[PDB]
Design a binder for this molecule. Sequence first.
Ligand SMILES: [Mg+2]
Ligand SMILES: [Mg+2]
Ligand SMILES: [Mg+2]
Ligand SMILES: [Mg+2]
Ligand SMILES: [Mg+2]
Ligand SMILES: [Mg+2]
Ligand SMILES: [Mg+2]
Ligand SMILES: [Mg+2]
Ligand SMILES: [Mg+2]
Ligand SMILES: [Mg+2]
Ligand SMILES: [Mg+2]
Ligand SMILES: [Mg+2]
Ligand SMILES: [Mg+2]
Ligand SMILES: [Mg+2]
Ligand SMILES: [Mg+2]
Ligand SMILES: [Mg+2]
Ligand SMILES: [Mg+2]
Ligand SMILES: [Mg+2]
Ligand SMILES: [Mg+2]
Ligand SMILES: [Mg+2]
Ligand SMILES: [Mg+2]
Ligand SMILES: [Mg+2]
Ligand SMILES: [Mg+2]
Ligand SMILES: [Mg+2]
Ligand SMILES: [Mg+2]
Ligand SMILES: [Mg+2]
Ligand SMILES: [Mg+2]
Ligand SMILES: [Mg+2]
Ligand SMILES: [Mg+2]
Ligand SMILES: [Mg+2]
Ligand SMILES: [Mg+2]
Ligand SMILES: [Mg+2]
Ligand SMILES: [Mg+2]
Ligand SMILES: [Mg+2]
Ligand SMILES: [Mg+2]
Ligand SMILES: [Mg+2]
Ligand SMILES: [Mg+2]
Ligand SMILES: [Mg+2]
Ligand SMILES: [Mg+2]
Ligand SMILES: [Mg+2]
Ligand SMILES: [Mg+2]
Ligand SMILES: [Mg+2]
Ligand SMILES: [Mg+2]
Ligand SMILES: [Mg+2]
Ligand SMILES: [Mg+2]
Ligand SMILES: [Mg+2]
Ligand SMILES: [Mg+2]
Ligand SMILES: [Zn+2]
Lengths: 83, 23, 60, 206, 18, 97, 127, 63, 155
Amino acid sequence: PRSLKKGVFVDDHLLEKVLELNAKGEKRLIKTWSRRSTIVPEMVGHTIAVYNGKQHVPVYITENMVGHKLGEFAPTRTYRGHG
Amino acid sequence: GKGDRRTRRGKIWRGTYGKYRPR
Amino acid sequence: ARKALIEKAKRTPKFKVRAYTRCVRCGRARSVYRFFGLCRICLRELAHKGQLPGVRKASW
Amino acid sequence: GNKIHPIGFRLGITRDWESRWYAGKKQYRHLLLEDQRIRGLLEKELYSAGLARVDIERAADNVAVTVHVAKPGVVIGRGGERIRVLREELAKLTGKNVALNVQEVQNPNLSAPLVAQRVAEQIERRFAVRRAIKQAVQRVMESGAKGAKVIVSGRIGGAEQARTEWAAQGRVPLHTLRANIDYGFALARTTYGVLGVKAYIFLGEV
Amino acid sequence: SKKSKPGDGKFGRGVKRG
Amino acid sequence: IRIKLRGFDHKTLDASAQKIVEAARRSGAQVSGPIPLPTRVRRFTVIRGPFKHKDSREHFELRTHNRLVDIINPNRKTIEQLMTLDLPTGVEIEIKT
Amino acid sequence: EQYYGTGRRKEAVARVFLRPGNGKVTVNGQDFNEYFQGLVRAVAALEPLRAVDALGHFDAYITVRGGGKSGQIDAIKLGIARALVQYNPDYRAKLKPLGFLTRDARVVERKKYGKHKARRAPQYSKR
Amino acid sequence: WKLEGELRAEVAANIKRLMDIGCYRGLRHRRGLPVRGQRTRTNARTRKGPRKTVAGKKKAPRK
Amino acid sequence: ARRRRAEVRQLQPDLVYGDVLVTAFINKIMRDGKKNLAARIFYDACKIIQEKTGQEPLKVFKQAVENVKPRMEVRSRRVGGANYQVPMEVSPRRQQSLALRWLVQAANQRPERRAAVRIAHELMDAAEGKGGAVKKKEDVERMAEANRAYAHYRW
RNA sequence: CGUCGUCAGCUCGUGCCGUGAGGUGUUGGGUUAAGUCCCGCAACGAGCGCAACCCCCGCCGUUAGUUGCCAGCGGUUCGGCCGGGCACUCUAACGGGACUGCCCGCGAAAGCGGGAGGAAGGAGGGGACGACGUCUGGUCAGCAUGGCCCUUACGGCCUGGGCGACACACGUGCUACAAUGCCCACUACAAAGCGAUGCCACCCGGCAACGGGGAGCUAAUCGCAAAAAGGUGGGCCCAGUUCGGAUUGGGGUCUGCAACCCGACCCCAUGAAGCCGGAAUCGCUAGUAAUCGCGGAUCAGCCAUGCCGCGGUGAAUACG
RNA sequence: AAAAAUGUUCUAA
Ligand SMILES: [Mg+2]
Ligand SMILES: [Mg+2]
Ligand SMILES: [Mg+2]
Ligand SMILES: [Mg+2]
Ligand SMILES: [Mg+2]
Ligand SMILES: [Mg+2]
Ligand SMILES: [Mg+2]
Ligand SMILES: [Mg+2]
Ligand SMILES: [Mg+2]
Ligand SMILES: [Mg+2]
Ligand SMILES: [Mg+2]
Ligand SMILES: [Mg+2]
Ligand SMILES: [Mg+2]
Ligand SMILES: [Mg+2]
Ligand SMILES: [Mg+2]
Ligand SMILES: [Mg+2]
Ligand SMILES: [Mg+2]
Ligand SMILES: [Mg+2]
Ligand SMILES: [Mg+2]
Ligand SMILES: [Mg+2]
Ligand SMILES: [Mg+2]
Ligand SMILES: [Mg+2]
Ligand SMILES: [Mg+2]
Ligand SMILES: [Mg+2]
Ligand SMILES: [Mg+2]
Ligand SMILES: [Mg+2]
Ligand SMILES: [Mg+2]
Ligand SMILES: [Mg+2]
Ligand SMILES: [Mg+2]
Ligand SMILES: [Mg+2]
Ligand SMILES: [Mg+2]
Ligand SMILES: [Mg+2]
Ligand SMILES: [Mg+2]
Ligand SMILES: [Mg+2]
Ligand SMILES: [Mg+2]
Ligand SMILES: [Mg+2]
Ligand SMILES: [Mg+2]
Ligand SMILES: [Mg+2]
Ligand SMILES: [Mg+2]
Ligand SMILES: [Mg+2]
Ligand SMILES: [Mg+2]
Ligand SMILES: [Mg+2]
Ligand SMILES: [Mg+2]
Ligand SMILES: [Mg+2]
Ligand SMILES: [Mg+2]
Ligand SMILES: [Mg+2]
Ligand SMILES: [Mg+2]
Ligand SMILES: [Zn+2]
């Protein structure tokens, strides 16, 4: 995992979109393409529309999904089996 | 064996070092 | 997707990691030798002409 | 498809490189690019003169291109004034002092690259492709050559079914290294597609 | 009816779009 | 007072070694005869075909030959004279103290 | 004083100096039996001077570099075998009929492209 | 350190946690597939189980 | 071989008992080229064979080899399209080979854990007439006496 | 470029035979790795092939003597370290050396068996080298290129996704199932290569991956570097184990704008199948197979157990 | 002195 000597990664353009929302009494529905961004405690209780390559999956954000990237919650392969 | 990272044998294989094979 | 990718590899990128070699002769992305700036094919073409200083079909 | 290029096979024994210089790992390639770039200019411009071999010599920030053209009058121009227009235009991409010699051709019918280019020309000019092979190989042998071979491939006569036509006189020991074999290639463009012209001259053994 | 293989049902042309 | 020569063709290297060592021997005296250092080979292995015929390659090497030569007693009638020599093109010289 | 012989086997080169004395054999400053401890093919390097009864007559000061202990062993056998006949040549007879005067040029065959090894070829399956 | 039965329970709560949030590693625990990026086209029998062989596409007959 | 007979390699006599049959044997003990290992194991069993049944090892070896040398064996033939079991007599060279081969194989069958003990024990039994390697030799000879009916098919 | 196949073959000029296709020569006896060579002959020659000339390895000479080497004397903090020296080792160019040259035996000859000298003997080992052709073999996606087709789109930029999917099936491989083994400590011996936003000595922090300092090296000098199997010594005691190291939990490191999909590595924990594999099936004739480790191209990193090389140890067997 | 059947249509470059 990312060297903790370095930061904790958020694209800085998705974070701004949040803090603003925090300020003015959020929540708008947040869409973004930063699957690599980490779920940060400021985000908890928003819902971020994450891109799966095709669509913006809407994702609610709770205290227990905080160590993660947002891409973890919008899978990219639609499988449903063989048969 | 060579697949055992936790031995002087497995570090010789993966060409790495560590506690189990220092330098 | 050929010529616009000949150009793009020349352009200095938005990030260091996006740099990549291309054959300077034919444009090939794969099998590009740093020493020559050439893919493994053009290498074998220019070699057999003797247009490559000191290069000689090895044997041993 | 099997056979080895007969010049790349003789490099060091019967054949010298078209580029002579040492350069270190750090700037070999950049010299090679100019080298390739240079020849492009001159094969592009001095084709009409009957270009045969671009020797490129380097010492340090001064490069020594040497053309081997059949009719050098087409190169020099109005008394050094065409040579000049390119002795300059060479430095325009060279950046170095581009010293440009022109060398006579001993006998053009002994320069495989030329035989090719001339047969290639004739088949680009709608002649009988079989005839041109038997004619070129005749001219070479008359010139004391100890053997000569010419090979055409593609849509001969625009025949849909591509073919291979060749003819050979004297002897051409391709498996021999001490045999001096001038080998050249020419490419023949036509309205129906492309044809490849290969010329082998046995100049004799050493 | 576009670029390469597989074919999109038009002669010569395939399903891939640009 | 030392000179080291480099080239891809040993025939040019070995030759200009002798014509150097001799010229200093001309305005001598003491010169340490040309030592052959080990050659540094840069190999290239290439798939013979342009497509898919993996198990058929062809080889290519690049030999950088190495000669070192030592002139012991300078005698500035070669520290002058050497500057005017005849070194072919496939050769580079580094000179040292 | 000394009677020398140069010995080579398989990338291994050995310099043997035959000097008379009690029997002291010595390789790169280490004792012989200390340098080839537990390598059961050690006594082969000495076999030459048994064929000419020189066992205890001599001592031997020896150096080796290259290859491995075994290549160094058959190097030594050849060098001493030549060192010996470079002390008198009449020894050549009765030393040549045991191959002591010859160098086996068995070398590591190079790997060829399209194989895994020199001649071990990749596995076949038709379909 | 913590051990036999308690370690098992903390391991269980972590896996249990991932499937609840619905993350990628959570889904790969639900479907019982590999979790650490292995290929699943042709391997993963530790994770997948014994081979459940099914019929294949038939080669055409001659004639 | 097709064009010409294969030539029998002459091996180097061993450094202890100066014997080539020792070398051939140590060569059969060897896997993965680790000859120094196989030397040890053989020689180590000569310790165990010196102690147990106090006798000269080299002699207990040689006698076990001789007692395993098979003099008969069936080979296959073809006459028409037949898959025969034709009894033939074993060449002295192959005699020695199969015997060395079986000795080792019976050894690794034995139930003792350390190798030289396994060797030393199949070596004593075989110079006395017991032993997996002797069972195999007699088996070979029995089937050859069996199919003596197809002996006129010999070549 | 693949391939038949390094298989021993494919042809031509003139003469002769035949109405003609075609034949002869190239068939025949002997020989050879070989259409290699001998002898025979309505054929006599000639070309493409075979061999040879080229490269590496094996012995010897010359030429050289630093960054390499240390035989013998002088020092020495005991390191070829310093004096010196180039003998040797080596390094890298130029040569010599093997030709069935000699002896015996067979033979018409070519050759064949054997012997001697010799480092090497019957082509010394290996490589490079691939006939006329075959397969409407492969490549329009390396390149080139005729014809067909697209033109605010079948072109071009971007962000994200995918090329990594997984009821299944095959191929080429890695690691094993163990005691001729596994583990810890200590101690030996390579070759070929790579290395100035590179190799990193050495020093401290850290169990470690690493980090921080920090000399030397434009490199026969400095570094990558330790080779590993080996040898010595201890531990395991036949157990799904101190065999095996898959899977999963947790915690880190680094490269990188960025490691969710989808990186390598480190440490704790976990510790699967696997007890030598059905029908069937592959490679190798000697420094080969097997086994051991090392390096390089590509490359920020890396999914390399792949590929191309390198040396260590070193067998079995071929009747036919 | 022979275990063992078969190979869709047009094209042969
Ligand atoms: Mg890149
Ligand atoms: Mg590239
Ligand atoms: Mg038109
Ligand atoms: Mg598809
Ligand atoms: Mg459709
Ligand atoms: Mg596009
Ligand atoms: Mg392969
Ligand atoms: Mg090897
Ligand atoms: Mg295959
Ligand atoms: Mg996957
Ligand atoms: Mg039907
Ligand atoms: Mg035929
Ligand atoms: Mg005729
Ligand atoms: Mg007639
Ligand atoms: Mg005729
Ligand atoms: Mg024929
Ligand atoms: Mg014929
Ligand atoms: Mg005929
Ligand atoms: Mg006939
Ligand atoms: Mg042959
Ligand atoms: Mg005849
Ligand atoms: Mg050498
Ligand atoms: Mg000398
Ligand atoms: Mg040849
Ligand atoms: Mg086709
Ligand atoms: Mg194209
Ligand atoms: Mg096209
Ligand atoms: Mg793929
Ligand atoms: Mg299977
Ligand atoms: Mg693999
Ligand atoms: Mg498999
Ligand atoms: Mg390394
Ligand atoms: Mg278990
Ligand atoms: Mg079980
Ligand atoms: Mg265990
Ligand atoms: Mg273990
Ligand atoms: Mg984890
Ligand atoms: Mg990733
Ligand atoms: Mg067991
Ligand atoms: Mg098995
Ligand atoms: Mg063979
Ligand atoms: Mg192993
Ligand atoms: Mg590697
Ligand atoms: Mg890499
Ligand atoms: Mg992976
Ligand atoms: Mg029948
Ligand atoms: Mg039917
Ligand atoms: Zn290219």
